[PDB]
Amino acid sequence: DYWRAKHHPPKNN
Amino acid sequence: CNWTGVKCNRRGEVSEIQLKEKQLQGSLLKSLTSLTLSSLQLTGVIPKEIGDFTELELLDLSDNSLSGDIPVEIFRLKKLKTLSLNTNNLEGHIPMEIGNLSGLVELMLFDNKLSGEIPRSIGELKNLQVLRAGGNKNLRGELPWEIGNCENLVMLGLAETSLSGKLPASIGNLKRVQTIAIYTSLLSGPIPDEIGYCTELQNLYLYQNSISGSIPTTIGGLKKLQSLLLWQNNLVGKIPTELGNCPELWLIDFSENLLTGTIPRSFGKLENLQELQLSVNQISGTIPEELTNCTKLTHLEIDNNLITGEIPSLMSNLRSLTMFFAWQNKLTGNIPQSLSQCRELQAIDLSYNSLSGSIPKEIFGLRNLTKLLLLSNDLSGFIPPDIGNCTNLYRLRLNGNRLAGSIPSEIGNLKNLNFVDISENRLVGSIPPAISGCESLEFLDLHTNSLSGSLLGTTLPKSLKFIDFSDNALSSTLPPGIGLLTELTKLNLAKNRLSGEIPREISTCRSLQLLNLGENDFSGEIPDELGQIPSLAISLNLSCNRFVGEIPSRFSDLKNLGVLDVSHNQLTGNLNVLTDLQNLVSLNISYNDFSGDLPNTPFFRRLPLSDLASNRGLYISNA
Ligand SMILES: *[C@@H]1O[C@H](CO)[C@@H](O[C@@H]2O[C@H](CO)[C@@H](O)[C@H](O)[C@H]2NC(C)=O)[C@H](O)[C@H]1NC(C)=O
Ligand SMILES: *[C@@H]1O[C@H](CO)[C@@H](O)[C@H](O)[C@H]1NC(C)=O
Ligand SMILES: *[C@@H]1O[C@H](CO)[C@@H](O)[C@H](O)[C@H]1NC(C)=O
């Protein structure tokens, strides 16, 4: 199944 | 007649069949109207006799295993309103004859094996409301121009397909469309300006394509716009000021594009904005103070950009902020204490900036802050004792700053603190015994500081996995209590003033993969129990010390050791004990008193002649 709408994943240090 | 799943007309003829989730197998009354065979785990092709039921207004074959083509005969059903074929193995093209189903409203093709292009015929379907063909990897070509003729379209999604090229200006004719979802596709070229003609647009999802050009200004005239996801494209130019004219906009994600210019002031007018992601772009300028007017912001991610100036104190007006990421920018000035007025903050990352001054103690009064990441700045002053007030602190990184003074005892009040990196700072004094109180502590990196004094096993929590105290002034003896940390994986004490023997209690660290004792004053004889740790795998570095005597015979047991450096010691005798480690990769034996012959095996032949030349008697003997 294709993925539902998502935002850009946040990246932290 | 009356049985379960059957429905009949008033004239007594079967009008409906509905079967949902019965767990079956295999393949599959001219008055029929609605036919649902769904979630039955059926297989085989769709029989083309389906095109014989002329009164069918609903066909739902969804959530099965069906394969083969979508038979052209299916489009003989002139009264069809819903066609639900989604979630199957269906292959082939979508036939042109699809334009024949004059009254189609719902069309669900998603999650199949479909291919080819989308027929120019879709333009004929003027009652079409919802078209969802997404999740077909091989559905290709441009979205047809004729899509503009479906003027009742409220929902279009083509996501996770090979749909390519540029969206046609025709799209501006869909005056009723609400969601456009085409993401993780092959789209390229610019977003057409005509999109501003879609007066009812609410959700626009174009992320993970090759879309180029600039975000059209016309998008500001869309008054119903709520969510905009354009992340991970090639977008260029400045963020349109006119975006601040959409009152209903709660989510903006432009992350990972080529955007330049400034974060526009008009954003202050967005009273519904909860989430702003600009991460990974070229945005210059300073964070405009009017952004602090957005009362509802929970998530602000501006990291990896060109932003300069100071973080505004009016940040305190964002009372719902849970997440603030500005890392990797040109920010300068103090971190504002007023940031402590956003009481919901879960995560702060300001790393990789020019921030300077003290870390304001108020930030440590946040009861929900799990992540505090300030690494690589110009910060200085003390770590405030208030650090112990920050009850949920999990990951703390202060490393790569000018921090001075000593690590405050109150850090020991943090029971959730998992990971702490204070390396590369000016910290002085002892490691405080109270750190024994951090019962969750796993990663501890203090390297490259001015720390000194002694080292007690009582001072460290037994849940420790990674320890790096290297490049400090630490002294006296490695405490026997070191044996109590049974979880310890990597241990690095190098470049200190430590002395005495290696305590045999070292053998009870059953998990230890890496041990670096390099560049200290250690002396005496390398204990036999140091062989006694078969987990030692990654490296063992004993070099630049005063060790004497031979390599203890037990070193033949470390069958997993990949790297071994004993160099620059007073070690004697031969290397025979090592001839049997087939997993030994790097061996530095230089600057010792070793003597004797090495075998001609390829590994010992590998050793540089200059490494042999710094010893007493070492040579290759030919067998
Ligand atoms: C961390 O906790 C301490 C201790 O409760 C706070 O310190 C006190 O603050 C009150 C006023 O808020 C004063 O009446 C007390 O005299 C202070 N007590 C001590 C022992 O210093 C401290 O302000 C908290 N820190 C933060 C940043 O919220
Ligand atoms: C072992 O420690 C010395 C002294 O700190 C260091 O310079 C050397 O690079 C280390 N050996 C390895 C294999 O990294
Ligand atoms: C010993 O040799 C290894 C491998 O060449 C090297 O990485 C390490 O830095 C050397 N150690 C010292 C003390 O120079």
Side-chain angles (χ1 to χ4, degrees), chain A, chain B residues 3 5-20 24-40 42-623:
Chain A
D1 294 23
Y2 76 95
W3 285 354
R4 52 185 279 197
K6 292 185 174 61
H7 65 183
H8 171 264
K11 180 177 67 169
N12 68 247
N13 291 276
Chain B
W3 180 258
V6 188
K7 302 174 185 179
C8 272
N9 193 7
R10 50 174 44 204
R11 59 182 298 206
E13 319 160 332
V14 174
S15 204
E16 286 181 56
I17 291 167
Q18 173 155 322
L19 306 183
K20 284 192 92 293
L24 291 66
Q25 218 89 12
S27 295
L28 57 164
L29 40 105
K30 301 169 77 171
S31 57
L32 208 46
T33 278
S34 153
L35 173 67
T36 291
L37 304 173
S38 173
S39 316
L40 315 173
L42 309 174
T43 49
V45 296
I46 290 161
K48 32 190 171 78
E49 293 87 71
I50 282 279
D52 296 341
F53 297 113
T54 329
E55 255 47 55
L56 222 40
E57 293 142 15
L58 184 139
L59 185 68
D60 179 1
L61 301 184
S62 70
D63 193 31
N64 279 302
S65 220
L66 308 171
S67 44
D69 279 38
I70 296 173
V72 165
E73 290 72 9
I74 259 175
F75 310 112
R76 292 177 178 167
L77 309 169
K78 220 71 186 293
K79 298 172 178 203
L80 199 68
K81 285 168 69 196
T82 301
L83 178 60
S84 222
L85 306 176
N86 58 279
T87 329
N88 281 291
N89 297 322
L90 293 163
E91 47 173 346
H93 293 197
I94 305 174
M96 301 292 296
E97 290 86 356
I98 196 182
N100 249 261
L101 298 180
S102 198
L104 203 55
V105 177
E106 316 295 343
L107 175 63
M108 309 291 194
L109 304 179
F110 59 86
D111 298 317
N112 275 305
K113 296 188 172 180
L114 290 175
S115 50
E117 294 189 88
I118 290 175
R120 301 298 213 160
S121 267
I122 26 73
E124 287 168 359
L125 310 166
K126 291 207 157 38
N127 303 113
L128 189 60
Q129 274 177 38
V130 162
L131 157 51
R132 305 179 52 216
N136 290 276
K137 211 199 167 58
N138 292 311
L139 200 288
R140 66 160 300 278
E142 305 208 14
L143 178 64
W145 178 267
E146 284 77 7
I147 193 76
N149 300 309
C150 303
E151 287 182 14
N152 284 8
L153 253 184
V154 79
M155 161 73 196
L156 168 75
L158 302 159
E160 298 197 32
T161 57
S162 298
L163 208 67
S164 59
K166 78 177 81 279
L167 290 183
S170 258
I171 212 66
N173 275 121
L174 303 178
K175 260 82 190 181
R176 311 192 127 169
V177 88
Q178 282 186 241
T179 296
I180 291 174
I182 310 171
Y183 55 77
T184 321
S185 287
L186 304 177
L187 286 188
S188 47
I191 299 162
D193 287 271
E194 292 83 355
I195 226 209
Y197 290 133
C198 300
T199 124
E200 302 293 315
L201 195 63
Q202 293 191 8
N203 317 309
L204 176 59
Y205 308 145
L206 303 172
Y207 63 89
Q208 309 188 294
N209 290 284
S210 304
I211 297 166
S212 56
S214 63
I215 298 156
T217 289
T218 60
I219 279 182
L222 298 176
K223 298 314 191 261
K224 308 296 188 63
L225 195 69
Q226 316 201 325
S227 57
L228 193 54
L229 302 177
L230 300 176
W231 64 279
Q232 208 171 282
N233 288 282
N234 298 309
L235 294 162
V236 118
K238 75 190 63 181
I239 302 174
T241 274
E242 287 87 4
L243 269 179
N245 299 325
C246 316
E248 296 300 321
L249 196 51
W250 73 275
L251 168 59
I252 296 178
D253 200 334
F254 302 158
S255 313
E256 296 205 49
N257 278 280
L258 303 165
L259 306 170
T260 56
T262 259
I263 300 185
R265 297 184 288 98
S266 66
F267 275 17
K269 305 188 297 150
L270 299 172
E271 288 183 317
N272 293 291
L273 185 63
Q274 296 172 35
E275 188 151 342
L276 175 57
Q277 307 203 160
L278 306 179
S279 305
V280 202
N281 280 282
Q282 289 154 55
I283 300 176
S284 41
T286 72
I287 310 162
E289 284 224 299
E290 30 279 290
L291 223 211
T292 75
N293 235 45
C294 297
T295 269
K296 302 211 265 182
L297 218 46
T298 69
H299 295 61
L300 182 64
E301 279 120 86
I302 58 178
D303 61 283
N304 289 279
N305 284 283
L306 306 172
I307 321 291
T308 53
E310 301 200 23
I311 294 161
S313 47
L314 275 180
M315 220 77 190
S316 44
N317 264 101
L318 305 167
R319 294 291 155 92
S320 290
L321 201 62
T322 75
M323 179 162 328
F324 182 36
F325 287 3
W327 63 278
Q328 187 58 82
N329 272 289
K330 308 299 174 186
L331 301 175
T332 64
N334 276 76
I335 297 166
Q337 72 112 64
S338 71
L339 203 40
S340 81
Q341 293 175 47
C342 315
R343 303 298 299 168
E344 318 299 320
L345 279 172
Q346 291 154 24
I348 310 176
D349 192 344
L350 307 176
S351 315
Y352 296 109
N353 278 288
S354 287
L355 297 160
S356 61
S358 277
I359 304 170
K361 62 183 176 196
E362 290 83 5
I363 225 83
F364 284 113
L366 297 164
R367 299 175 59 247
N368 263 113
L369 184 59
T370 58
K371 297 175 181 177
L372 179 48
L373 310 171
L374 307 176
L375 68 93
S376 189
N377 278 285
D378 202 34
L379 293 172
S380 65
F382 297 143
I383 302 176
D386 313 69
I387 184 165
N389 291 31
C390 192
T391 278
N392 280 291
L393 203 48
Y394 187 83
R395 177 182 186 77
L396 172 63
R397 301 195 73 174
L398 309 187
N399 60 293
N401 284 289
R402 280 189 289 117
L403 306 173
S406 41
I407 303 169
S409 283
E410 16 278 283
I411 188 173
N413 282 287
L414 302 187
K415 309 300 170 177
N416 311 125
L417 184 56
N418 186 255
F419 181 112
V420 37
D421 190 4
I422 328 201
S423 64
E424 283 182 309
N425 272 287
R426 320 247 253 253
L427 299 174
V428 291
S430 287
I431 291 159
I435 189 176
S436 56
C438 298
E439 47 203 31
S440 282
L441 187 62
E442 282 184 315
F443 181 99
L444 179 56
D445 200 331
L446 303 175
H447 80 257
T448 296
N449 271 293
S450 296
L451 297 181
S452 77
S454 162
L455 206 72
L456 301 6
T458 52
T459 305
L460 304 173
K462 277 67 199 175
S463 66
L464 268 170
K465 294 201 190 329
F466 178 101
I467 288 172
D468 195 347
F469 299 161
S470 55
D471 194 7
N472 276 287
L474 293 182
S475 70
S476 217
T477 72
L478 189 56
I482 198 268
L484 293 179
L485 316 168
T486 75
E487 312 282 7
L488 187 62
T489 287
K490 309 193 182 184
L491 170 54
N492 179 4
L493 296 171
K495 201 171 197 307
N496 277 291
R497 291 119 181 87
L498 293 170
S499 60
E501 258 88 335
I502 297 169
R504 307 175 191 278
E505 0 277 4
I506 194 87
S507 65
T508 62
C509 298
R510 30 173 171 276
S511 284
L512 197 47
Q513 291 172 25
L514 183 146
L515 173 65
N516 192 347
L517 304 184
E519 219 168 314
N520 277 279
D521 205 38
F522 291 112
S523 60
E525 210 160 24
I526 303 162
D528 209 77
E529 300 84 353
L530 184 53
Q532 224 136 42
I533 324 164
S535 59
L536 268 177
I538 298 174
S539 83
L540 170 53
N541 190 341
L542 297 180
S543 77
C544 313
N545 282 286
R546 288 179 310 106
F547 291 112
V548 303
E550 297 182 335
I551 306 188
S553 53
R554 211 210 174 281
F555 275 26
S556 47
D557 285 343
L558 302 158
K559 229 72 192 155
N560 289 322
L561 186 56
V563 172
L564 179 60
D565 196 342
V566 300
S567 68
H568 285 97
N569 286 284
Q570 294 154 271
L571 299 169
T572 61
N574 61 61
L575 301 190
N576 297 344
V577 58
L578 273 23
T579 57
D580 236 35
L581 304 172
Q582 73 286 4
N583 287 324
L584 197 47
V585 181
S586 173
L587 183 52
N588 193 337
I589 52 59
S590 79
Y591 298 91
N592 283 282
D593 304 300
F594 296 119
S595 80
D597 58 279
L598 315 161
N600 212 155
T601 90
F603 182 57
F604 291 91
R605 181 71 165 97
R606 152 196 170 275
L607 300 185
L609 195 31
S610 35
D611 277 11
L612 307 183
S614 55
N615 283 266
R616 181 182 294 172
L618 296 176
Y619 67 99
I620 276 82
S621 80
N622 299 120

